[PDB]
Structure 1
Amino acid sequence: QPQVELFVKAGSDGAKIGNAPFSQRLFMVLWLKGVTFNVTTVDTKRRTETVQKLCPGGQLPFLLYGTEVHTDTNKIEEFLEAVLCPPRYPKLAALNPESNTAGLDIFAKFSAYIKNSNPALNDNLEKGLLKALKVLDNYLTSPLPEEVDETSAEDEGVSQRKFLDGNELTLADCNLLPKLHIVQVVCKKYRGFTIPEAFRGVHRYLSNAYAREEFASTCPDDEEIELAYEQVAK
């Protein structure tokens, strides 16, 4: 197996896991593949000579795979899915294309909401974020094709699956979860906004996902996410 070396953004002390959802996505993908790999955190204020030579452009995250450096998180993920493939490693792509688009609008609605300084817009932007969360909730509670005609007591017509695409984490979860987690942490800390308990699909999803080691072991501390947002969200 050619060397697999991921370079990710360090947090506020120049070393810890940072608020860096592209970096976290790739760490999750590599974890789920089962490959042996290394992860090096990068202090962009103090780049090592090694990092400077590997990736002169300074893009981050980046991947060294064998001799070659890959940049652009989407392209790195596509490369990993293609090269770390069956029979040696599991395919991680979602089976259902809608799993790859569900919830993609949430982050931008969050950004507008949290950065807004015109109080007249508060309720509009909060509602836009809630509506995007509800669309994700609806996807998570809609039976997938694998669940056709299955039934559960007191819960007719409601999906039971753990994650976006089924009962296994897929590339779609690796993309969405780091961002959705930022939304939840920052909104709670700076505005007291909580995802309603009535969004049972979103809450079950996060409960399952946050307990998966692939997420838990790659996730920065709440206080690091909160620090990263202090200036824009205050």
Structure 2
Amino acid sequence: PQVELFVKAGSDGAKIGNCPFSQMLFMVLWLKGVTFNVTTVDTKRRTETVQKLCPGGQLPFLLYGTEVHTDTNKIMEFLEAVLCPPRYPKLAALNPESNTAGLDIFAKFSAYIKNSNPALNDNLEKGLLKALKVLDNYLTSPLPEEVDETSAEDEGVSQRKFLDGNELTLADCNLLPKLHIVQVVCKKYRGFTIPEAFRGVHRYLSNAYAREEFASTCPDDEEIELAYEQVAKALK
């Protein structure tokens, strides 16, 4: 059953551009173990093929057999329901709160980065830090699979690699691409790095960069930086 993901091209019109939703789906497809390919689209220079396939012009989109699917969340839910055991792993998180943890972070960063008002900068860095902190608390809070197993020096502190346990789940495919943007953009434009003291977050990002499903599907740092150049440069 043929599977082809269409994604937003970057600045040369060929390579992967900045698009967390595109990366999210590329991640799900990789984690499913399914045979798929990926076509980048220069949206300013669309092939007649892509034009016929997806008249609405939405990106990303998925061709599955003969059927075109748009809307990233809906595609994700479709992939989860159509690619099941025993042939493909379920990737849905077991704990519903894994799906909501960290979700307000991208919006705090969006306000932070778009801001050009100096008296509001310190408020906005704080809103972003507090959001990251709440994700940190999630990542260090033991989940039901870890019930009552510990180490005297680290009691009540989760050792798990990712949001919902030790395997990547749909919840990570959603958050990780957004959190990667946050990291790259804020370093480049705002002298900002996630504090060391957020150890859950740092371990998470570290175990994520160790995984080729995340790392190989990231657009280059340049591509993300260029995407944000106009909105980010505004703060004097």
Does TM-score exceed 0.5, indicating one fold? yes
Deviations 1:20-75 (A, max 9, x none): 10000000000000000010000001000000000000000000001100000000
Can you list the C-alpha shifts for 1:147-179, whole angstroms capped at 9, x where unaligned?
A: 011112421110000000000000000000000
Paired residues, number:
233
Give a deviation string over 1:105-137, Cα, whole Å, max 9, x none. Answer: 000000001111111111110100000000000
Q: Specify the alignment match of 1:124 in structure 2.
A: 123
Q: Secondary structure at the match of 2:213?
A: helix
Provide, for residues 87-118 of structure 1, a one-character-per-residue CA deviation record: whole Å limited to 9, x for no partner: 11000000000000000000000000111111
Give the secondary-structure state (helix, strand or coil) at the position aligned to 1:154: helix
The percentage of aligned residue pairs carrying the same residue is 99
Cα separation, 2, equivalents of 1:153 and 1:223 = 44
- Ranges of 4+ aligned residues in structure 1 off by more than 6 Å: none
2:106 alignment counterpart: 107
CA RMSD in angstroms, aligned pairs only = 0.6
Q: Partners of 2:110 and 2:215 in 1: how far apart? A: 24
Could you give the per-residue CA deviations for residues 198-220 of structure 1, whole angstroms, max 9, x where no partner exists?
00000000000012000111111
Question: Which runs of structure 2 are paired with 1:199-214 in the superposition (5 Å)?
Answer: 199-214=198-213
Q: Quote the Cα distance in structure 1 between the aligned partners of 2:42 and 2:22.
A: 13
5 Å-filtered alignment, 1:76-155, equals: 76-155=75-154
Point out the more displaced range, 153-162 or 199-208: 153-162
Q: 5+ residue gaps in structure 2?
A: none
Report the alpha carbon displacement of residue 17 of structure 1 after superposing the two structures with TM.
1.2
CA distance in 2, matches of 1:217, 1:188: 21
Q: Which residue of 2 aligns with 1:168?
A: 167
TM-score computed with the length of structure 2 as normaliser: 0.98
Provide the residue aligned with 1:16 in structure 2: 15
Aligned to 2:34: 35
3-state SS, counterpart of residue 40 of structure 2: strand
User: What is the alpha-carbon distance in structure 2 between the residues aligned to residue 9 and residue 40 of structure 1?
Assistant: 9
TM-score, normalized by length of structure 1? 0.99
- Give the Cα separation in 2 of the matches to 1:159 and 1:131: 20
